[PDB]
Amino acid sequence: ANPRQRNKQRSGKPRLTRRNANKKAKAKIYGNFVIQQNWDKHATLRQNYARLGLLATPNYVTGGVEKLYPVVRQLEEEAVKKAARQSNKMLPLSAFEHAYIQRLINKYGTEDFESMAKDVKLNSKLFNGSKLKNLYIRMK
Amino acid sequence: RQLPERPSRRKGHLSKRTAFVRSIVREVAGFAPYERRVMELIRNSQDKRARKLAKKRLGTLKRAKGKIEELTSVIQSS
Amino acid sequence: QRYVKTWFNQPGRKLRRRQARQTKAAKIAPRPVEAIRPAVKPPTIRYNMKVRAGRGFTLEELKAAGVSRRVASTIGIPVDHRRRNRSEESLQRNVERIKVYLAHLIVFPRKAGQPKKG
RNA sequence: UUGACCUCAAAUCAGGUAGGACUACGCGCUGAAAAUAAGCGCAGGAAAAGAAAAUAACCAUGAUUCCCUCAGUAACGUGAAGCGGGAAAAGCUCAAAUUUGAAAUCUGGCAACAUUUCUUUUGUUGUCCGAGUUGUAAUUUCAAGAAGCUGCUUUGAGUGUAGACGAUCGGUCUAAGUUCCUUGGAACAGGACGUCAGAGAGGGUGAGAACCCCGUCUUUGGUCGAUUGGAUAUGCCAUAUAAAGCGCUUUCGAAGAGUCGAGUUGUGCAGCUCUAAAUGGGUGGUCAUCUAA
RNA sequence: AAGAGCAUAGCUGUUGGGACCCGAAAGAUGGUGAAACCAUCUAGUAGCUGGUUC
Known part of the structure; x- marks a missing residue:
């Protein structure tokens, strides 16, 4: 009706036909590979979550439930596996630190972490006692 | 249950600096008409x-x- | 009785929102669609005998429950810096709401950053 | 005699940006015989609002928006709001505190080096000039927090490769009568005999065509692409002399002014006259609640 | 004083929306000409006139 839409009604240029509509636009799953294998491309998301043993929501369902009649283990072992592979949170000492703590321990014994902190010459960086122990245990 | 203070309700109490900064400006600025x-x-005691x-x-x-006690204390200090 | 609002898009708004739910969780599968909300008492005399979902767990609820503010929003536990526990009843009802949550939670490990040296 | 700056210019100076259109919905402002129409200004795929200077009077609630309810109630024919049920959910950033054992920051020129929806896009590295101490970074935002002490737990604004997985653009593949008899210019009609069907939607063809043709079903998919989203595996670099959470405190805790507000005037806001404070100030019912500019 | 309603659909009545159909003299906004004109408000206003279908 509008001149604009009358233009391409009386024009000869073909439209920009864009083919988009899909009945039941159930979006397919990406993200986790485990769930993506064991998804049901037909059933609904709240069915699929309850099928797998995953709580769809922790909070109460604000409507009805589905009553038709009168993976979680895999996710668990995969989880503890990766925590095991990436577990060694311990860090070594760089060459500077290797000398830095050695010179402090070669002169203030080994357990007087309050004395090393008070030192003004060797403990130039003014590291507190809590970090001095951290560098100590990091050496071993 | 007693509740620890919410730090917003601390608002407006005073500071040792904010008081000091306000005292200096009182002297430096002067006084309004x-x-x-x-x-x-x-x-004149009126x-x-x-x-x-x-x-x-x-x-x-x-x-x-x-404001009156602000000025009277200023008078005594002067 | 001028301009009217007519609801012929009510059935299509029902599906538009259903597809948005479908689109959302499909992006974040293993995790639930929604966060956990606390259980709070309505603020009236007509409604103080009922329990309803809150907005999030106060600072003290998470502190006793064992999560700090920063790691509580990552794993999906909203915080409510406004709300506060005036009585031990609400503290215990919501502390043990997070207790069952942290028991049913499987926090997947992330990628670490390991410099070549210390 | 020579120079710092401060302010102000000029240039077809180097590089940029603004205007006009559309206006269904957005935000203003102005405004009739309804805060309407018309007028005026301004935006985006949404806009606006928005992390309480908020309600309430409870066993308290907890940004905003929207729907239902509250409710034609309350207050004064106009016409609420809180609570209640839902949809959606996500939080945050500055100013005000000395980086003072180091302006740690950034624009630009050139020089290189990569990257690309892309020779069109986007940066990094070095280097010189400047910006900037009348304050650019790090830190902090009241929910706090900083500075110490403590001892536990954590860490990439990287870059290739590979595969799976979604997203888009285009190309590509699809079952079975056109067999006889009468009507007719025409068999797509009538009858006979058969077939296909995950396809008997629709259209075309010389009259009612599942089986002539295009399609339809398969397709919630095969196939060749072309770009890409986010994860996963693995390789190579990595400033970690660091940065962050939480116990503890014999330490401290900065918080927005011709604005709040009082008098009057125009229809909460605005104009004029006057002009604040620091447990202060605002809003509710001495307590509660919030912490504006 | 041993509760009778709640919802829906239909019929009819009535009140309000353009309100059974058509029709009056003004006005308001914003414009175009040189008070007039133009498109809006606007289906302005009816106590009244005319019509109202087997």
């Missing part, structure tokens, strides 16, 4: 005339009250 007139009336003048200027009694 009305504060000059009010101060002179205290020195306080009842002085206090009623302040309420006309500011608008409320507590505001008028509060």
